[PDB]
Design a protein around this ligand. Structure first.
Ligand SMILES: *[C@@H]1O[C@H](CO[C@@H]2O[C@@H](C)[C@@H](O)[C@@H](O)[C@@H]2O)[C@@H](O[C@@H]2O[C@H](CO)[C@@H](O[C@@H]3O[C@H](CO)[C@@H](O)[C@H](O)[C@@H]3O)[C@H](O)[C@H]2NC(C)=O)[C@H](O)[C@H]1NC(C)=O
Ligand SMILES: *[C@@H]1O[C@H](CO[C@@H]2O[C@@H](C)[C@@H](O)[C@@H](O)[C@@H]2O)[C@@H](O[C@@H]2O[C@H](CO)[C@@H](O[C@@H]3O[C@H](CO)[C@@H](O)[C@H](O)[C@@H]3O)[C@H](O)[C@H]2NC(C)=O)[C@H](O)[C@H]1NC(C)=O
Ligand SMILES: *[C@@H]1O[C@H](CO[C@@H]2O[C@@H](C)[C@@H](O)[C@@H](O)[C@@H]2O)[C@@H](O[C@@H]2O[C@H](CO)[C@@H](O[C@@H]3O[C@H](CO)[C@@H](O)[C@H](O)[C@@H]3O)[C@H](O)[C@H]2NC(C)=O)[C@H](O)[C@H]1NC(C)=O
Ligand SMILES: *[C@@H]1O[C@H](CO[C@@H]2O[C@@H](C)[C@@H](O)[C@@H](O)[C@@H]2O)[C@@H](O[C@@H]2O[C@H](CO)[C@@H](O[C@@H]3O[C@H](CO)[C@@H](O)[C@H](O)[C@@H]3O)[C@H](O)[C@H]2NC(C)=O)[C@H](O)[C@H]1NC(C)=O
Lengths: 100, 100, 100, 100, 99, 99, 99, 99
RNA sequence: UUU
RNA sequence: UUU
RNA sequence: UUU
RNA sequence: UUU
RNA sequence: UUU
RNA sequence: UUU
RNA sequence: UUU
RNA sequence: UUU
RNA sequence: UUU
RNA sequence: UUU
RNA sequence: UUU
RNA sequence: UUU
RNA sequence: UUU
RNA sequence: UUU
RNA sequence: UUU
RNA sequence: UUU
């Protein structure tokens, strides 16, 4: 099971994806509860706590810091949007604290 | 029944969520009308008036001021996006008029 | 039939809404074609031409200028987002060329 | 088959559209796999590599540079949003490296 | 004389120029008063009222509307600064109403 | 005297004015010290503490809060600069708390 | 001489420098005219035409394109200002075309 | 002496201060050269190299990293300018690394 | 099947 | 900080 | 049923 | 300007 | 039907 | 750079 | 079943 | 301020 | 686009 | 010393 | 936070 | 004239 | 909105 | 020389 | 990156 | 007083 979230207002807009379908999913903080679909869209009203989603017998933790890094990539790509060949690559270079 | 909205153009992008399904829902200002689904996505063309949604025998009022506070959190999180560990927390501190 | 669009990249993100269901819908510029659903989501790859959507025997024209006014309201509401009681109202006052 | 994507956080928010239905679709980088629907929404967690989607016996390549050009059009349309008659047209003129 | 101002905080930073020299200069709202030099720099604390300068017997009125047009040209030149050959020119066409 | 400052980097750029002349001026945090001229420009390296200037025996205190209000008026005038007739006026109403 | 300008509203704020002194200086579009001092500050009301300064017999032309590159470096240094060690350096590589 | 600079286009605008007076001042990269006055204003065309000033026998080095921190404080004070009582203070904590 |  |  |  |  |  |  |  |  |  |  |  |  |  |  |  |  794969979870990808983007920032939406005060919380997050998310989806859970498993190529072989999602058979069960729950969250202590996000509005999703299923006890078969391949993809489920859901939101989290707050990200003060990190996003926690149980899905297909697998606990998934998407840190709020990770969500801010993604929005940083989105923000600086739009900033460098007049340079469309290097905008995203330079945004990843500035926003990802890992490696260089 | 739970209603969460984010700003979209001149109005709002919303969804109504009830873990035990939504059996009836209406709105004097938003495009939604059902007389069973667990989650319903809908928009409101204008937020000049506060979002009012009746859902499962329960009147829900999401103030436009509340929606602006959420967009404020989104805006300043993207502003502080180069500091991914404190960006959201500092945005909540600036945008939420409650408490400190 | 009601059509509401917001700007998405180079084009627009739209939905068509009729409380009594949508029985037919088409567009010369947007990716939608049905010949019964109450709500249909669709996008338009370009808004160089104004959005034209035929829906339930009714031609609907959402001008690109109208879409920019909505994004203006969204932009300045986020600008005034530290003043959540007047942010949207002041954004409507600046972005809507009609009346005052 | 038609693919349209917008930037969403670190990756992209996409949909695949074929007026005569989508019978098969896959992607080496995006979360989508079907082996009949007219429209399929899906995301790509990263756009470091260009978006590649096979759909209805047709390989589709949406370059990341192309996605940045679209976000540029979105960014400068919001910038010129106080001039709703020329905002989008002037944004296309600045952000599209082709022709003039 | 010749008066040129730019916005500075709540008011404006100005300069009075005259090749033959500034013999006398005063203002009802700006901090300048002389009763000869070619160049006199001064500030105006507020621009709620237009910048009015009496210099060498001529009434100079730099409208705040005009100052905002200049600040508009500066703002959009910085926004278009990745396109240096067209940044200033495109900013003039977007900011000057009479073009 | 009359003191007017605008924000400059971490501190502020200031000017002291007096039509009759500045006889003496000092400051505990700004680079100015004289013990007559009508106009004296000086800078303050930091504004963590309010700009305090002792000029002609008068204690001048320009609060940093006041300087930020002026920078607010400048910032929103540039944001509203496509509307030159109302840019400065609308920026004053959004930035000045006592209005 | 040496001429350095930055954008100021619709035009530019400039400075002419020469260690041996500025003996004469003029301009067809900027407010400066002298016919010796080491340093002369002056403004140009418009930069629709490039800043042309005739100083000590040398023709100085500071292209508006060059001024926008400098304003680009200033703008992106402020945008990258949370990364102070690389802000100016990264802004130079994004703004200077010949790098 | 005391040197304070702010970013100006591609380089910086600076001021050298000394209550007892500036007897001599030079720089390898900035336009200033004297060999007494209390205050000397000068500009540096580039800040790719740190602002180095030799004033009264003391070596002054204002790192470009330090100048960007000051520009950071200015930028976020304008962003927080609707909150004038906490704008400067909050900008200091976000921009100064050693806090 | 703790609502 | 969607009540 | 002009692809 | 999603090919 | 290489997991 | 959604683990 | 006020359209 | 999606007509 | 300082008149 | 073209006002 | 100009050392 | 505390370097 | 420099008091 | 209205403090 | 003021030539 | 290297133009
Ligand atoms: C929620 O869903 C998970 C995942 O469901 C499993 O994976 C899907 C992709 C489908 O293939 C489902 O059919 C499949 O059950 C459930 O967790 C899984 O539970 C089963 C219980 O039978 C586990 O199987 C066991 O596996 C162990 C070794 O791992 C063997 O020794 C056993 O003999 C038995 O085969 C399976 O491993 C486990 N998977 C994971 C990832 O934990 C979960 O039970 C379910 N919960 C509820 C309440 O329905
Ligand atoms: C719209 O939907 C609401 C909510 O529906 C109720 O809650 C859902 C989660 C499901 O469990 C539904 O099956 C359930 O009806 C309706 O409001 C509800 O109406 C019922 C009428 O039978 C109310 O039950 C009564 O409750 C009182 C005490 O509250 C008892 O004394 C009665 O004997 C009877 O049991 C129920 O309380 C009420 N719930 C709420 C939150 O108001 C509503 O009727 C419905 N409207 C239409 C037009 O369908
Ligand atoms: C596409 O859909 C429209 C709209 O469909 C109509 O409205 C929906 C809300 C549902 O109630 C549908 O059942 C309904 O047909 C179609 O346009 C409609 O076509 C009908 C044809 O029978 C028109 O009815 C006529 O109306 C005139 C007066 O208006 C009478 O004199 C006739 O006797 C007859 O009743 C109806 O007015 C018309 N509606 C509109 C808004 O134009 C359309 O035909 C359809 N197209 C296709 C290809 O299916
Ligand atoms: C994935 O889907 C594609 C596309 O599917 C085709 O187009 C859709 C719009 C529907 O009409 C489908 O019914 C249709 O199959 C498949 O590619 C297609 O495969 C067929 C195989 O029969 C090809 O037909 C052949 O075409 C050649 C000439 O092109 C003739 O000489 C043959 O006699 C035969 O008719 C068809 O051309 C091809 N289309 C494309 C665009 O490649 C694909 O097979 C499928 N894959 C899987 C694994 O299902």
């Amino acid at each position: 099971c794969t979870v990808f979230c983007t920032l939406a207002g005060p919380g997050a807009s998310c989806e859970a994806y498993s190529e072989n379908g999602i058979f069960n999913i729950s969250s202590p903080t996000c509005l999703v509860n299923k006890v078969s679909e391949q993809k489920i869209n859901f939101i989290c009203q707050r990200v003060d706590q990190d996003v926690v989603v149980y899905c297909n017998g697998q606990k998934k933790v998407i840190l709020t810091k990770t969500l801010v890094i993604g929005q940083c990539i989105y923000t600086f790509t739009s900033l460098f949007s007049l340079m469309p060949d290097v905008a995203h690559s330079l945004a990843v270079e500035l926003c990802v604290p890992g490696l260089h």
